[PDB]
């Protein structure tokens with residue numbers, strides 16, 4: 075034991091004051107819209123924070139370890155020294171919380187849960203060890219779907235403490251396939267944006283699962299548990315699922331839906347507020363677009379006339395570099411930043427929507443995708459510009 | 463030379479007479495709706511047929527070969543005997559033509575091209591050698607993105623002859639990443655539904671690229687050409703791209719869009735016609751749903767009231783087996799068949815839409831996704847039931 079998960083909030087780390095706080099305990103927060111999109115790589119200070127419990131505190135860093143157990147030949151135990159000695163990779167990858175844009179779905183028909191605007195999302199450079207390498211180390215070769223021992227899934231278990239698990243830890247799981255395929259870039263990350271991982275973001279070690287919803291990138295690892303069936307954790311089985319609009323608290327059956335992993339094409343306008351005063355002339359419409367599953371953004375469309383007509387915005391990743399969608403130069407796990415300059419002379423509704431590399435679209439209206447958990451609001455984002 | 467590509471249509475193979483023919487020369491055809499969905503595995507007789515030119519004819523089977531050239535150490539030449547001696551795989555995979563459902567898009571605003579109804583799609587068991595294995599044979603190891611010789615793409619060149627290429631061959635390409643990853647199941651297929659591959663479908667050898675539009679699964683292979691940049695073939699650069707609705711023949715710039723590979727969530731009702739007479743009582747609404755990229759179908763929704771309310775249809779792959787979406791038992795490259803029994807007492811509009819494992823949705827209206835080439839019509843399919 076080099077680390078503990080507190081059961082109360084007295085030793086929480088400090089955060090940037092500019093953060094819009096959606097829940098204090100546990101800590102759930104997001105940057106102001108106008109700062110989200112200022113840079114392609116999200117500074118740690120401004121990277122959104124989503125926690126189900128108190129933040130773990132490390133008393134003694136050497137003596138911290140991740141335990142490799144379950145359907146494995148030799149249940150080893152891996153120290154932070156051991157993880158840093160594996161071949162290091164740097165993966166650029168956006169974490170988007172499945173809760174992103176929930177508040178606007180709630181406004182239409184109420185949802186229980188923490189409120190989020192348009193910034194429950196962040197892009198960072200993750201440094202660490204590939205999970206496939208770590209599993210090779212324990213007798214599970216690369217590109218394996220299942221083993222002779224019955225292994226099919228990999229469960230990541232935290233050291234934190236959540237009310238929902240009655241004081242137990244946050245957990246998630248992924249398939250052995252995904253875990254064991256180095257091209258899927260699942261990372262045991264000990265670094266974020268070139269610095270040592272912070273407390274808020276999972277120090278000393280988190281999993282990062284690219285192209286998958288935020289909720290699966292488990293922070294503050296206690297164990298990596300190789301198992302026969304998917305994790306039966308509360309947050310795999312009784313959350314983070316996409317129900318149809320007909321489903322409510324009286325008819326919900328949690329086993330009727332599969333756990334959400336991949337996520338669909340998303341965009342939002344960030345350079346202006348949902349209802350914003352402007353001076354006549356040129357206004358810069360800037361924002362983000364992403365899709366899960368390693369799919370890029372082929373197109374961002376912007377409309378000034380209630381969606382009769384669209385004009386195409388520009389798209390960019392690393393600044394200077396030209397963005398190309400299904401391409402070896404592109405950062406396939408990361409968002410894409412969009413900009414369009416428009417001419418305003420009158421009170422104007424502006425709308426943004428994105429289309430990904432697989433030609434997937436965003437739903438026109440929240441109503442068609444409205445869901446009980448208030449997740450994956452990918453409605454066309456509509457903003458209103460007014461003449462002040 | 464054991465095979466040739468004709469320049470004229472005098473030696474075309476026979477087809478099933480039930481086929482609805484959309485163009486005779488070259489041969490472009492699709493089964494009647496009502497037969498499409500009778501079985502999970504589409505019989506070869508009824509599997510849709512899409513050709514840009516005359517069908518190649520083989521005069522001498524031994525002496526046919528595929529040539530491995532380009533950015534490769536030892537330009538080998540591989541005979542059909544050699545391909546069959548590699549480890550055989552059987553992959554279940556749906557080919558959907560990017561042109562599927564084009565005619566309905568054209569009704570709204572005219573598109574140039576061959577007309578298709580709802581059946582430019584088919585599901586089969588493909589037998590052959592993995593392309594990753596074949597490339598390993600020529601010194602390119604598995605899970606490579608690029609090589610020291612500058613290789614980044616793999617181009618498949620046919621032996622056929624197309625007007626568009628001025629008598630030259632149909633070609634496509636994929637990334638070295640996709641080609642070389644055995645989990646992507648790219649196959650050099652010599653078998654289809656347990657029999658030897660037909661002429662129509664590429665005898666003796668075609669590529670099948672799962673989870674990617676039909677157009678990339680190049681038939682009647684002449685050469686597998688490892689190269690530094692994407693193929694400059696006509697059908698990669700000047701076709702099979704997804705343009706926004708504002709693009710027309712006066713403003714089109716082909717380099718403005720990337721070549722379409724993955725495709726989005728699609729469904730159609732097949733057990734009844736777009737306008738159909740029924741007797742009061744119980745009517746079975748049966749169809750297909752698919753998505754590209756190895757994504758499953760999480761949900762199919764059916765509405766009888768103009769899309770105010772939806773009820774969930776059932777979903778099935780292999781009969782008897784229970785379909786589960788992101789699961790080891792599921793056929794991730796294959797379509798999903800849906801059925802719902804409904805009660806009709808009155809004249810009724812029925813609507814079907816699907817939602818994939820990544821929670822991607824279908825666009826409500828063609829207008830929003832209308833495009834010049836008339837590809838990837840994934841509009842909600844609406845049918846009209848009348849009281850006769």
Ligand code: MTQ
Pocket residue numbers: 121122123124125126127169170171172173196232233234244274275276287288289290291292293294
């Ligand atoms: N140990 C641990 N405890 C958590 O509550 C926990 N929650 C997260 C969810 S649920 Mo969601 O609501 O799909 S977004 C999200 C991210 C947030 O990463 P970060 O704080 O570092 O921005 O951490 C995931 N990882 C976790 N790990």
Ligand code: MTQ
Pocket residue numbers: 509510511512513514515557558559560561620621622632662663664675676677678679680681682
């Ligand atoms: N050699 C060759 N010539 C073709 O014209 C050719 N066209 C195809 C397209 S273009 Mo599309 O417009 O996206 S659907 C489709 C499929 C059809 O395979 P099959 O006919 O056996 O169903 O083969 C692709 N492979 C090809 N291979």
Ligand SMILES: [Cs+]
Pocket residue numbers: 139140141296297
């Ligand atoms: Cs431990």
Ligand SMILES: [Cs+]
Pocket residue numbers: 402403404405
């Ligand atoms: Cs890159």
Ligand SMILES: [Cs+]
Pocket residue numbers: 527528529684685
């Ligand atoms: Cs050849």
Ligand SMILES: [Cs+]
Pocket residue numbers: 790791792793
């Ligand atoms: Cs399977």
